[PDB]
Structure 1
Amino acid sequence: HRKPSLLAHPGRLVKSEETVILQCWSDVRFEHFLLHREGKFKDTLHLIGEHHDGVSKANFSIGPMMQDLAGTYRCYGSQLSAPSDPLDIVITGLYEKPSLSAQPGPTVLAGESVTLSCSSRSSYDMYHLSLECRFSAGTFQADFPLGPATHGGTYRCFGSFRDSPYEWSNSSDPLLVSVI
């Protein structure tokens, strides 16, 4: 049959020892759902399908978040169906937080270019920016050009090592970009 849809509540990034809900859903009334994860430890969970309010779903709960639960998740509806769009689930808060700074300034003028940069004293191999975006750290830092300003917001940032791309540092202090 057809591939289902897969999304996380409240999101993809999971604080250490907290929980998420990876929910599969479709309009096809599947009897069962399968959850498969690729990573350091591969598993396959299965649940019975719920049918109420115009959607066929199953709520997988991945609780006390540990490093063996981080990876890329796919989803199947029951022979099996086509695989759902992949989804990476990430552990945060295993390392000290980086610094997030704006090269021009946090408050800029419309049309001006702005550049954010994440830095730390640890040997992080790449950084991540949220409002997603990723670049390799070479004070190990990476620079993020955002172009001419339009609608600023709030940004956070994380660092990681290359042998474990699903294990992120703590979150940097949020920084607000105002475009007057």
Structure 2
Amino acid sequence: RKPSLLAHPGPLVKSEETVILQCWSDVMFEHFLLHREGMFNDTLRLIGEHHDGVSKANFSISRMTQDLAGTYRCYGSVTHSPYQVSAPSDPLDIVIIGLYEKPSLSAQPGPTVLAGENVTLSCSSRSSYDMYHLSREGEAHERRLPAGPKVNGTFQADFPLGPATHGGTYRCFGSFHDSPYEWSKSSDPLLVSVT
């Protein structure tokens, strides 16, 4: 069975700041394997610490650098079965943010709608970002879309939210094709409310 993987304080890290990745399972794993897919692929074996019912292991990053950015997954293991590991934790993208000008985030028809209204959030900027990333507070994986051709000055991606059900606070970021885990500064948060 797969462990959990979380970043403290969060997966979106400013350049040279710290982040700690933690693997944990209510299953008493002796060791955890933390695997990163990115510019520098690596798999680290961490010793599981037992904390009253929980087994967990940390991988601490003192200064966030692009070599540590990427998609991470954790596996739990036990020594009586050295050649087998648990199913993988859900992937967690550790990204470096705050590297470029923050984009603009707007909602159509607007940020306050009735349930069912078809809402679209648009991320835009004068910077020539190749991709935009949409983050919703409290929701795990960022959505992404390629920026639309420059419509004379502006580069933008339109994220459909579909018929409104639940509100949320959204933020967005731009990135370049050369580096999928290096993003701009966050747009100002947008609160979408649904009645």
Provide TM-score, normalisation by structure 1: 0.85
Q: Which residue number in structure 1 is paired with residue 115 of structure 2?
A: 110
Distance 1:161 1:129 in 2: 15
When structure 1 is superposed on structure 2, of 2-11 and 139-148 the one drifting more is 2-11
Consecutive unaligned residues of structure 1, counting only runs of 5 or more, are none
Q: How many positions carry a matched residue from both structures?
A: 177
SS at match of 1:122: coil
Shift of 1:80: 4.9
Matched, 1:162 2:177: yes
Shift of 1:129: 1.2
Consecutive unaligned residues of structure 2, counting only runs of 5 or more, are 77-83, 136-141, 149-153
Distance 1:84 1:155 in 2: 25
Matches within 5 A, 1:17-32: 17-32=16-31
Shift of 1:82: 4.6
Matches within 5 A, 1:76-95: 76-77=75-76, 80-95=85-100
The one-character-per-residue Cα deviations of 1:96-147 (angstroms, maximum 9, x if unpaired) are 11011123222333433222111111111111112x2211112010112223
When structure 1 is superposed on structure 2, of 7-16 and 79-88 the one drifting more is 79-88
Distance 2:29 2:155 in 1: 49
2:160 aligned to 141, 145, 161, which one? Answer: 145
User: CA, structure 1 residues 111+160, in 2 after alignment: closer, same or farther (shift >3 Å)?
Assistant: same
Shift of 1:173: 1.1
The one-character-per-residue Cα deviations of 1:55-110 (angstroms, maximum 9, x if unpaired) are 11112212211111101112233x65554433221111111110111232223334
Distance 1:82 1:62 in 2: 25
When structure 1 is superposed on structure 2, of 103-112 and 62-71 the one drifting more is 103-112
User: CA, structure 1 residues 80+104, in 2 after alignment: closer, same or farther (shift >3 Å)?
Assistant: closer
Q: Which residue number in structure 2 is paired with residue 60 of structure 1?
A: 59
SS at match of 2:67: helix
When structure 1 is superposed on structure 2, of 19-28 and 63-72 the one drifting more is 19-28
Shift of 1:167: 1.0
User: CA, structure 1 residues 51+179, in 2 after alignment: closer, same or farther (shift >3 Å)?
Assistant: closer
Distance 1:62 1:172 in 2: 25
SS at match of 1:14: strand
